[PDB]
DNA sequence: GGAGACACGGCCGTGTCTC
């Protein structure tokens, strides 16, 4: 199968490289006659020759329009006549782009920002990750003692053969390979990768830590960090605001971005994520404990176990998600490296671009939400279930032909009109998106049929994934319509789908209350929470599953709902803000928790203690008491200043800042005194009492003296503690005035 | 090419997630 595409430059000409795994072997095929191009709409076709004369400079090399060919395409369901302009190198596009548009005869340009290797996949009809090839995979993690200043203590890895650890101190455990030095540890890990020859290297946050650290130690220790199959090092790319790492010939599959896009929980640690997916706790050994262990030589077995489990948990996490991302890559028609790192929004973009090319539909340029909100029931509810609405929206798009090319169409015999908002949509022909959405579902059902028929357990799990991948993709179109940088953006399309949704949501809530006796506690654009007052947990589950079968029978065709989970209890504050606890006593908040370094520990600690009293123990009055004592204690100067420190990172040169927050005020005073302030530096400040802007009163905690300085009790009460609990407790009829001392 | 989900200090710009 096709694993990735890139290009290389030979004699100024782009050469496409197609990385493949066919018949068990890894091979790189090449293509030398694929040409970059853009499109251009001209006011006057006579001017194409002068447009062909437009030049530009690229590293002092002359860039020009090599060829021009007139082409008839369709733009948003209407014929359009543009000029396809060819070039020599893909790097010519951004050098000459704007001069072609700046030309007075050229109205605009189209398909001018499509990466060359992706353009290739689309145009040649190539689908990555397709077919029957078992890919070999290896997980790995590191343990480290300025970035990459200290040495790497351990490198763990895991696969089918098991999970081992490489360290440079003698640890008597069977899975621990003991090596002489850190350099030889890294070198030993390089051998194992080249020897196992995996197709996929799995990591957790390897884009922003593992690889980069490994680079800088190998940079310092004089090792050439070769993981690429052709002999290259890992390339650290830049994805706008963040970094990312490719390994040529292999697929670096970082689990972190995938997981955040897939599931929803407050803290995205390796243990939390593993606990949410596999329902088993994992011990976390902290960085203060590791240094202590490595320094003395006391507890290196526990540190070595933690590193081994890190590798093993990552591999089995890798085994769960990769097949799904594999399938999404086949549907979208882009590499797993890209699809694994994209937003749901951009997954729909690349799907639509590929389909646009197949139907000869010219792509619109980039520019470069909202929904149902029932006010929830108040207080703490026993035995809650969540049912998902998202499945409604694709069928709504399909049935009502909702598309930008069908919006307010001129001169049709049939129209479906949206409720409330009143937008119209043509019915004489099927829209671009709706017909594509229709086929995604028709394919999903055809997959489900063949799924049940086939009994090969491995292919029964493979076809299960394919169907699941179509669901994630189909469920993304609704959101994509209102996506900010969306090519096929249409606010009317979204409002309309929302409007038509209300009916089915209303009807669903109506049925579940009357025919089944539930009370809906919270309902939003995505789903709703519900219970049966006075009922046992098992009844609720049983009755909920009975409702699912009923409602999906009544809602025509592919109109569906899903049963997501049961929760022992919860409360509900406002839109997208609630908290729940499952039968395993695992708390799950949305839009409430504040577990971040820019909030003080006292605020974090008190909130967590409040969520515990309410959810695990069911004592709201104890939660109120907790906050009362804390606010009393803050004002009496009994809370340790260590719990009051705010950590905040400066992210570029101090001169760049257009607006000064507290941490930028603290940093600028340090810089005025010569003290090192670089991007990445972390200001840890505390707020002293008195007058002035918070920034004027804030000092560094290093410069803090408990005896001399007096922190700002009012600030930590009113701006930190109370804001973190007020909202939660407001859903129980408690106001700020009830919480202060 | 290159997310999003959503806060608060100060007069929307900026930061946090992971490691
Ligand atoms: Na122009």
DSSP code string of A444-486: HHHHHHHHHH---HHHHHHHHHHHHHHHHHHTTHHHHHT-TT-
In a shared domain, residues A278 and A409:
no
Instruction: Say if residue A512 is in the same domain as residue A656.
Output: no
Resolution (A): 2.7
Angle between helices A300-332 and A255-262 (to 10 degrees): 70
Q: Which is it for strands A424-426 and A519-523: parallel, antiparallel or unpaired?
A: unpaired
Spatial CB neighbours of A436, under 8 Å, sequence gap ≥ 6: A351, A352, A355
Q: In terms of domains, do A646 and A710 share one?
A: yes
Q: Which nucleotides of B are covered by protein (CB under 7 A)?
A: 1-19
Residue for token pair 């179509």: A470
What is the distance of C-alpha A376 from the center of its chain? 28
Structural domain tally of chain A? 5
What CA–CA distance (Å, rounded) separates A698 from A639? 18
Specify which residues A176 forms β-bridges with.
A165
Between the CA of A659 and the C1' of B11, what is the distance in angstroms?
9
A178 and A292 inside one domain: yes
Contacts of residue A542, Cβ cutoff 8 Å, sequence gap at least 6: none
Q: For residues A153 and A233, state if they share a domain.
A: yes
In 3D space, the residue among A320, A302, A313 whose CA is nearest the CA of residue A157 turns out to be A313
Q: Which residues contact A232 (CB under 8 A, 6 or more apart)?
A: A226, A248
Domain that holds residue A495: 364-430+484-569
Indicate which CATH number applies to the domain containing A513.
3.90.1600.10
Nearest-5° Cα angle at A147, A168 to A596: 110
A505: Cβ under 7 Å from strand B?
Answer: no
Residue A731 contacts residue A725 (beta carbons within 8 Å)? no
Distances (CA, A) of A509 to A498, A544, A546, A731: 16, 12, 15, 22
Q: Which of residues 546-605 of A touch strand B (CB under 7 A)?
A: 576-577, 590-591, 595-598
A681 with A596, same domain? yes
Nucleotide nearest A719 (Cα, C1'): B8
Q: Residue A603: which region, alpha, beta or left (left: phi > 0; alpha: psi -120 to 50)? A: alpha
Give the β-pairing of A106-110 and A79-86. Answer: unpaired
- d(C-alpha A37, C-alpha A43), whole Å: 20
Which among A594, A404, A613, A389 has a CA at the least distance from the CA of A506? A389
d(CA A595, CA A610): 14
- How was this structure determined? It was done by X-ray
Residue numbers in A 634-673, CB below 7 Å of strand B: 647-652, 656-665
Give the nucleotide with minimal C1' distance to the Cα of A210. B19
Contact A685, A719 (CB under 8 A): no
Q: Which residue is nearest to nucleotide B8 (CA to C1')?
A: A719
Instruction: Please give the Cα distance from A404 to A491 (Å, whole number).
Output: 9
**CATH number, domain with residue A435:** 1.10.287.690
A208 nearest nt, CA–C1'? B19
Which are the contacts of A16, defined by CB distance < 8 A and separation ≥ 6?
Answer: A5, A6, A7, A30, A31, A32, A34, A116, A117, A120
Pair (A392, A292) in one structural domain: no
Distance of CA A75 to the CA centre of its chain: 31
Which bin fits A412, alpha (ψ -120 to 50), beta or left (φ > 0)? beta
Evaluate whether A677 touches A654 at the Cβ level (below 8 Å): yes
CA–centroid distance for A734 within its chain: 36
Q: Is the CB of A113 under 7 A from strand B?
A: yes
- CA-CA distance, A244 to A252, in Å (whole number)? 10
- CA neighbours within 13 Å on the CB side: how many for A30? 7
Q: Do A495 and A585 belong together in one domain?
A: no
* Residues of A 341-400 whose CB lies less than 7 Å from any atom of strand B: 341-346, 366, 368
In the 224-263 segment of chain A, residues within 7 Å (Cβ) of strand B are: 237-242, 244, 256-257, 260
Quick check: A431 and A402 in contact, CB under 8 A? yes
Q: Provide residues 458-497 of A with CB closer than 7 Å to any strand B atom.
A: 483-485
Considering the domain architecture, whether residues A630 and A546 belong to the same structural domain is answered as no
CA nearest to A525, candidates A474, A475, A591, A491: A475
Q: How many CB atoms lie within 10 A of CB A420?
A: 11
Residue length of chain A: 741
Contact present, A127 and A336 (Cβ < 8 Å)? no
Name residue, tokens 């069977």: A174
CB atoms < 10 A from the CB of A430, how many? 17
What secondary structure does DSSP assign to A350-414, as a single string? HHHHHHHHHTTBPPPPP------BPPPPPS-EEEEEEEE-TTHHHHHHHHTT--GGGBT-SS-S-
- Burial label for A154, CB within 10 Å (0-12, 13-18, 19+), is buried
A477 and A504, same domain (yes or no):
no
Distance CA A474, CA A441 (A): 8
Q: A77: Cβ–Cβ under 8 A, 6 or more apart, which residues?
A: A405, A406, A429, A431, A432
A421 by Cβ neighbours in 10 Å (0-12 / 13-18 / 19+) ranks as middle
């Amino acid at each position: 199968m096709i694993l990735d595409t890139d290009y290389i430059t030979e004699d100024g000409k782009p050469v496409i490289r197609i990385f493949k795994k066919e018949n068990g072997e890894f091979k790189i095929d090449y293509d030398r006659n694929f040409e970059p191009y853009i499109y251009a709409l001209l006011k006057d076709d006579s001017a194409i020759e002068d447009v062909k004369k437009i030049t530009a400079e690229r590293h002092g090399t002359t860039v020009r329009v090599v060829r021009a060919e007139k082409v008839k395409k369709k733009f948003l369901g209407r014929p359009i006549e543009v000029w396809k302009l060819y070039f020599t190198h893909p790097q010519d596009v951004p050098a000459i782009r704007d001069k072609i548009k700046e030309h007075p005869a050229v109205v605009d340009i189209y398909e001018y920002d499509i990466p060359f290797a992706k353009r290739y996949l689309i145009d040649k009809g190539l689908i990555p990750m397709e077919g029957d090839e078992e890919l070999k995979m290896l997980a790995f993690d590191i343990e480290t003692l300025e970035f990459a200043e200290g040495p790497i203590l351990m490198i763990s890895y895991a696969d089918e053969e098991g999970a081992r650890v490489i360290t440079w101190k003698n640890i008597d455990l069977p899975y621990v390979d003991v090596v002489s030095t850190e350099k030889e540890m890294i070198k030993r890990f390089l051998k194992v990768v080249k020897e196992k020859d995996p197709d996929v290297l799995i990591t957790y946050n390897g884009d922003n830590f593992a690889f980069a650290y490994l680079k800088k130690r190998s940079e310092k220790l004089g090792v050439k960090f070769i993981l690429g199959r052709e002999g290259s090092e890992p390339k650290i790319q830049r994805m706008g605001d963040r970094f990312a790492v490719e390994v040529k010939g292999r697929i670096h599959f970082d689990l972190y971005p995938v997981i955040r896009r897939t599931i929803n929980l407050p803290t995205y640690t390796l243990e939390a994520v593993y606990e949410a997916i596999f329902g088993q706790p994992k011990e976390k050994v902290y960085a203060e404990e590791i240094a202590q262990a490595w320094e003395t030589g006391e507890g290196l077995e526990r540190v070595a176990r933690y590193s081994m489990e890190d590798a093993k948990v990552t591999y089995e996490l890798g085994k769960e998600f990769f097949p799904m991302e594999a399938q999404l890559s086949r549907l979208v028609g882009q590499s797993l490296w890209d699809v694994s790192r994209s937003s749901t929004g951009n997954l729909v973009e690349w799907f639509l671009l590929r389909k646009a090319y197949e139907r000869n539909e010219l792509a619109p340029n980039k520019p470069d939400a909202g929904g149902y909100v029932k006010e929830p029931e108040r207080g703490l509810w026993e035995n809650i279930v969540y049912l998902d609405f998202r499945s409604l929206y694709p069928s709504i798009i399909i049935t009502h032909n909702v598309s930008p090319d069908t919006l307010n169409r001129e001169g049709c015999e049939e129209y479906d009109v949206a409720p409330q908002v009143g937008h119209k949509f043509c019915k004489d022909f099927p829209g671009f998106i709706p017909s594509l959405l229709g086929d995604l579902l028709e394919e999903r059902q055809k997959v489900k049929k063949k799924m049940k028929a086939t009994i090969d357990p491995i292919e029964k799990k493979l076809l299960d994934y394919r169907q699941r991948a179509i669901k994630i993709l189909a469920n993304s179109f609704y959101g994509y319509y209102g996506y900010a940088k969306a090519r096929w953006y249409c606010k009317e399309c979204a409002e309309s789908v929302t409007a038509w949704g209300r009916q089915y949501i209303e009807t669903t809530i109506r049925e579940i209350e009357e025919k089944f006796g539930f009370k809906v506690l919270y309902a939003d654009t995505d789903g709703f929470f519900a219970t049966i007052p006075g009922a046992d947990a098992e009844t609720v589950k049983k009755k909920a599953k009975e409702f699912l079968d009923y409602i999906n029978a009544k809602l025509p065709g592919l109109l569906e709902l899903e049963y997501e989970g049961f929760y022992k209890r919860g409360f509900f504050v406002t839109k997208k803000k609630y908290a729940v606890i499952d039968e395993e006593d695992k708390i799950t908040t949305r839009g409430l928790e504040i577990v971040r370094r820019d909030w003080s520990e006292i605020a974090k600690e008190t909130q967590a203690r409040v969520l515990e009293a309410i959810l695990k123990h069911g004592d709201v009055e104890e939660a109120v008491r907790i906050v009362k004592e804390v606010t009393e204690k803050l004002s009496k100067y009994e809370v340790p200043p260590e719990k009051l420190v705010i950590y905040e990172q400066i992210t570029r040169d101090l001169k760049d800042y257009k607006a000064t927050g507290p941490h930028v005020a603290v940093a600028k005073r340090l810089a005025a005194r010569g003290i090192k302030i670089r991007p990445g530096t972390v200001i840890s400040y505390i707020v002293l009492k008195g007058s002035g802007r918070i920034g004027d009163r804030a000092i560094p905690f290093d410069e803090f003296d408990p005896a001399k300085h007096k922190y700002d009790a009012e600030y930590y009460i009113e701006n930190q503690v109370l804001p973190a609990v007020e909202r939660i407790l407001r859903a129980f009829g408690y106001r700020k005035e009830d919480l202060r001392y």
